[PDB]
């Protein structure tokens, strides 16, 4: 595996260069929003983002060393967590608003157009303000998003050798985070404290994914077939 031969700087460069683009929605400002149309917008957006996410995952160091079966399992478990952390990141500098797309910036009052979604909106908004207070950096963000991919399904997989490689890669990402913080001038105590603060946020991102997923496979009761398969993997 070449992933374990990367220096810390080379890891950040690999992750930064692999970043997916920020997509636009079909939001027509003149069309009055409804529950159906707003969910339409979020669903269309997420579906297009999934294609980029899949090709981004191939470029996370270590990921393509896994079997295809394992790659499928990690993406099925982590996809909404990954969409959510991206949303929270690009929303950092828009207090009280979620930047779903450059042309789709929503506050919580508009999230009430979909009954039951405002609770998730508030949690996303709170995570975004948390990042803003911490002044999360772009290099730290891409590390965290890669941790989510490799971590979120590794406990629901003859073959421990696959789980061992993922852990060696996850350890390499920890070294890279610490490396970023040491270059930022943080002390040793500050480095370990910030590292903990960042990983604890992953617990709230897991929580939001689970709560959101729960509502998505009740909203089932226009989506594309990939997202439907992604959604069904949680049932």
């Amino acid at each position: 595996s070449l992933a374990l031969s990367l220096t810390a700087d080379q890891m950040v460069s690999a992750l930064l260069d692999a970043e997916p683009p920020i997509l636009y929605s079909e939001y027509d400002p003149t069309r009055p929003f409804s529950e159906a149309s707003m969910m339409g917008l979020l669903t269309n957006l997420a579906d297009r983002e999934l294609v980029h996410m899949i090709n981004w995952a191939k470029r996370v160091p270590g990921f393509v060393d896994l079997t295809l079966h394992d790659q499928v399992h990690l993406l099925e478990c982590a996809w909404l967590e990954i969409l959510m952390i991206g949303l929270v990141w690009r929303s950092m500098e828009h207090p009280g608003k979620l930047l779903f797309a450059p042309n789709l910036l929503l506050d919580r009052n508009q999230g009430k157009c979909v009954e039951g979604m405002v609770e998730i909106f508030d949690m996303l908004l709170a995570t975004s303000s948390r990042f803003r207070m911490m002044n999360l950096q772009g290099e730290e963000f891409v590390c965290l998003k890669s941790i989510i991919l490799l971590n979120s399904g590794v406990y629901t997989f003859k073959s421990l050798e696959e789980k061992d490689h993922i852990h060696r890669v996850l350890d390499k990402i920890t070294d890279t985070l610490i490396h970023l913080m040491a270059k930022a001038g943080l002390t040793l105590q500050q480095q370990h404290q910030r590292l903990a603060q960042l990983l604890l946020i992953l617990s709230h991102i897991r929580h939001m994914s689970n709560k959101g997923m729960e509502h998505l496979y009740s909203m089932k009761c226009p989506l594309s077939d990939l997202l439907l398969e992604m959604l069904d993997a949680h049932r």
């Binding site: 899949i54 191939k58 295809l68 499928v72 993406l75 099925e76 077939d225 990939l226 398969e229």
Partner: peptide
């Protein structure tokens, strides 16, 4: 063969 499987398989 899931859709995600094929897309991960594409090259």
């Amino acid at each position: 063969h899931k859709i995600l499987h094929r897309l991960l398989q594409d090259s």
